[PDB]
UniProtKB/Swiss-Prot annotation:
Belongs to the peptidase A1 family. The chain holds residues 90 to 419 of 419 of the full protein. This is Endothiapepsin. It catalyses: Hydrolysis of proteins with specificity similar to that of pepsin A, prefers hydrophobic residues at P1 and P1', but does not cleave 14-Ala-|-Leu-15 in the B chain of insulin or Z-Glu-Tyr. Clots milk. It comes from Cryphonectria parasitica. The gene is EAPA. One of its GO terms (molecular function) is aspartic-type endopeptidase activity.
């Protein structure tokens, strides 16, 4: 089997991407944030505290003839941005782009933190990291990809995120029309539960490539590119007037600037992030200070190849017995 679904930016900045997902019988379609940095499929629901729902579409398990309470199971998750959610668990039929999993754990939110409530466009998350990170207790649950894998034509999914435009998540096949050149594959460590890999270096604009190993994660659920402070300083030093602002929470730059590109290495190959992809617009409405799309990872503990980086590439998440990642230009 295969599946193919369009993923759409939630706003004009590409702050996140939503992909429609069919849950239950008859289908209830929710727009989920596909997140290769986590491993829970959770949804706003009829059980979510009413004051914490503000415009999201909810899953109502009582209206699904295939929903079954997973007795005794609870979940609770906290994300790197400080947001969180928790609740109980159903199993139900879940379909993405024509690919159907029966018995998928659908984690129903009883509580969500303010940032989720305040984002009316995201009805939940669909985790695509390794199932070892799934938070369901006392019986850990598998991700949608893990459940689908054996049925797929090939045990892979691909992320093709657009810049200020829709893109595609495919399951079970590699669309050879969706990229240019060849796909360069690179090793993955699953030891932290992530799609963790090592970039071979970077360049700023037309500058020379610096060969240096940068361990990080391919994370579709993180907006920006978070890299070591040395690398980030070298980037922003090429933008007149750019500075790190403790009050704003990162590098800002004059909105009048033209940003240089940023290149990262994948083995001997190179992915170029155009300068425009690094512009996240005014820090507040009407400001002439703009927020940068490359930020320091120093306070995180891990480097994160988020959407800013991934949207410059066609990305293969290869879930073979020994997982690997593939990157191609597009």
């Amino acid at each position: 089997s295969t599946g193919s679904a369009t993923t759409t930016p939630i706003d004009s900045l590409d702050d996140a991407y939503i992909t429609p997902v069919q849950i239950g019988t008859p289908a209830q379609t929710l727009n989920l944030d596909f997140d290769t940095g986590s491993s829970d499929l959770w949804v706003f629901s009829s059980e979510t505290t009413a004051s914490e729902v503000d415009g999201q579409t909810i899953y109502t398990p009582s209206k699904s003839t295939t929903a079954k309470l997973l007795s005794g199971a609870t979940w609770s998750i906290s994300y790197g941005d400080g947001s969180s959610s928790s609740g109980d668990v159903y199993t139900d039929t879940v379909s993405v782009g024509g690919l159907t999993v029966t018995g998928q754990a659908v984690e129903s939110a009883k509580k969500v933190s303010s940032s989720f409530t305040e984002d009316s466009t995201i009805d939940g998350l669909l985790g695509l990291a390794f199932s070892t990170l799934n938070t369901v207790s006392p019986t850990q649950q598998k991700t949608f990809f893990d459940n689908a894998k054996a049925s797929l034509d090939s045990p892979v999914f691909t992320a093709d995120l657009g810049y200020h435009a829709p893109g595609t998540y495919n399951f079970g096949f590699i669309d050879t029309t969706a990229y240019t050149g060849s796909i360069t594959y690179t090793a993955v460590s699953t030891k932290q539960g992530f799609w963790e890999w090592t970039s071979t270096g970077y360049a700023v604009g037309s500058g020379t490539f610096k060969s240096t190993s940068i361990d990080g994660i391919a994370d579709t659920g993180t907006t920006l590119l978070y890299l070591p402070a040395t690398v980030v300083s070298a980037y922003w030093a090429q933008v007149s007037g750019a500075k790190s602002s403790s009050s704003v929470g990162g590098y800002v730059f004059p909105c009048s600037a033209t940003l240089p590109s940023f290149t990262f290495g994948v083995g001997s190959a190179r992915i170029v992030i155009p300068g425009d992809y690094i512009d996240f617009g005014p820090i507040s409405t009407g400001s002439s200070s703009c927020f940068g799309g490359i930020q320091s990872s120093a306070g995180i503990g891990i480097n994160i190849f988020g959407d800013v980086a991934l949207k410059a590439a066609f990305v293969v998440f290869n879930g073979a017995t020994t997982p690997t990642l593939g990157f191609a230009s597009k």
